[PDB]
Amino acid sequence: NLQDARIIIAGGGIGGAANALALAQKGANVTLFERASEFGEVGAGLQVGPHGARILDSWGVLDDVLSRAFLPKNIVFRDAITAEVLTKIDLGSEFRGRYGGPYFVTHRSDLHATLVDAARAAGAELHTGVTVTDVITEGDKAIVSTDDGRTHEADIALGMDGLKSRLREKISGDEPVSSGYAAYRGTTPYEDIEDVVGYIGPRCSFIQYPLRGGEMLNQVAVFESPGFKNGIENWGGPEELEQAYAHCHENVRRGIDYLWKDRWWPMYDREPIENWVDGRMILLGDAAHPPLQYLASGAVMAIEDAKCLADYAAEDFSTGGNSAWPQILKEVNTERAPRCNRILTTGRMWGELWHLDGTARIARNELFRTRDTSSYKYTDWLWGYSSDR
């Protein structure tokens, strides 16, 4: 366990929250600083596969999350031009047995609030409206600076400040890499859908799934922005959606009418990095490994990061104390980097596979149609992973 240890977390997204929970359940003294004036997430959906669900269950929050979630029966891929089914991934009891948990979908806002609340319950001290301005290591401590002029000492600091992480600059000068694709979301108060459906087409895709016991439908449009390639600064705006989808089936074109249009998510990732550690600071979540969303595992990775850190630290700290932290951070980095970096790189290829045109589309469609649906070789690496040693 971790009662002698103090950890400061910079950032209160799903990642920071999950880490606060995991670490506080082990008895650690956790202080989290979130820049925003309140905790909150987008009132739209995310998908959480069993690689995340198993971990939420281990923290005792799964039943509660599920009470407000939806359990899809399948993931269904369809051709975006014809609407024909290409293949399904069955999410039933055989899937759940193999992977240790359900594939579920829920609101981001609810998952985030549930983690925050549980982190509070377990003894984590969460502070909104506080920005971390610097983190250094001096001797056997992380020294964290905040925007109110104060400095705080801890045994380690977690850099969990997202895709646009400034703390990542301590380790890497890289910039986000544009995919050239943008994402729009919508929910609409709810032919019928009880699955995650993904329509995959030339330079575009469209995803639908139910939320909250089937009352609402989550919709997401991902498309190649011509403005990006043309050098537009604020690229992927909604003027682009009609042409992006014009070649698709009616089922998909109808969907576009529900998207929220006042806001969108231009899709960027970063090139994978092996080293996440700077003294007694470690980058986790998107600050370390921000993906493109095709594997629906960014938030999941962050949740995995939390389980790994807390587990490995509870294992090592009880025998080595606060002197052990640099070895613990190294071990966590060693475990997590190959996993997450494969998700980054594979995710790029997987999205490219969605968006193929011409003959490449014809080959892709046939590949998906003819597969051995009883094999798990395309998904075990993702859903069957665990950090447990």
Ligand X SMILES: Cc1cc2nc3c(=O)[nH]c(=O)nc-3n(C[C@H](O)[C@H](O)[C@H](O)COP(=O)(O)OP(=O)(O)OC[C@H]3O[C@@H](n4cnc5c(N)ncnc54)[C@H](O)[C@@H]3O)c2cc1C
Ligand Y SMILES: O=C(O)c1cccc(O)c1
* Residue 126 engages ligand X in binding (rule: CB under 6 A): no
Residue 115: is it exposed, middle or buried by C-beta count within 10 angstroms (0-12/13-18/19+)? buried
Helix (H) or strand (E) holding 119: helix 108-121
Rounded to an integer, what distance in angstroms lies between the CA atom of residue 190 and that of residue 168?
41
Residue nearest to ligand Y (CB): 293
Helices (H), 174-260: 226-230, 241-244, 250-256
Residue 298 contact partner, candidates ligand P3A, a second copy, ligand X, none, CB within 5 to 8 A by sort of partner: ligand X
* Residue 14 engages ligand X in binding (rule: CB under 6 A): yes
User: Residues 18 to 57: which contact ligand Y by CB under 6 A?
Assistant: 45-47
Closest to a second copy by CB, 147 vs 380, is: 380
* Residue 385 engages ligand P3A in binding (rule: CB under 6 A): no
* Residue 198 engages ligand P3A in binding (rule: CB under 6 A): yes
User: Of 263, 301, 271, 297, nearest to 183 (Cα)?
Assistant: 263
Rounded to an integer, what distance in angstroms lies between the CA atom of residue 171 and that of residue 52?
27
Task: Write the DSSP assignment of 351-372 as a string of letters.
Answer: HHHHT--HHHHHHHHHHHHHS-
Of 85, 232, 360, 362, the residue at the interface with ligand P3A (CB under 6 A) is: 362
Other beta carbons less than 10 A from residue 383's beta carbon: 22
Q: Give min distance, CB of 107 to ligand P3A, in A.
A: 17
Residue 53: is it exposed, middle or buried by C-beta count within 10 angstroms (0-12/13-18/19+)? buried
Rounded to an integer, what distance in angstroms lies between the CA atom of residue 236 and that of residue 265?
8
String of contacts with a second copy for each residue 351-380, x by CB under 8 A: -xx--x-xxx-xxx-xx--xxx--------
Q: Report the SS3 class of residue 33.
A: strand
Among the residue ranges 26-34, 94-102, 172-180, 293-301, the one whose residues contact ligand Y (CB under 6 A): 293-301
Task: Name the pairing type of β-strands 29-34 and 6-10.
Answer: parallel
* Residue 87 engages ligand P3A in binding (rule: CB under 6 A): yes
Residue 177 contact partner, candidates ligand P3A, Cl ion, ligand X, none, CB within 5 to 8 A by sort of partner: none
Q: Is 47 annotated as a binding residue?
A: yes
Of 59, 103, 199, 294, the residue at the interface with ligand Y (CB under 6 A) is: 294
Residues that bind ligand P3A (CB under 6 A): 75, 87, 89, 196, 198, 207, 295-296, 346, 350, 353, 362-363, 366-368, 371, 377-379, 381
Residues that bind ligand X (CB under 6 A): 10-16, 33-36, 46-47, 131-132, 160-163, 166, 183, 265, 285-286, 293, 296-300, 302
List residues forming the annotated binding site for 3-hydroxybenzoate.
Answer: 47, 209
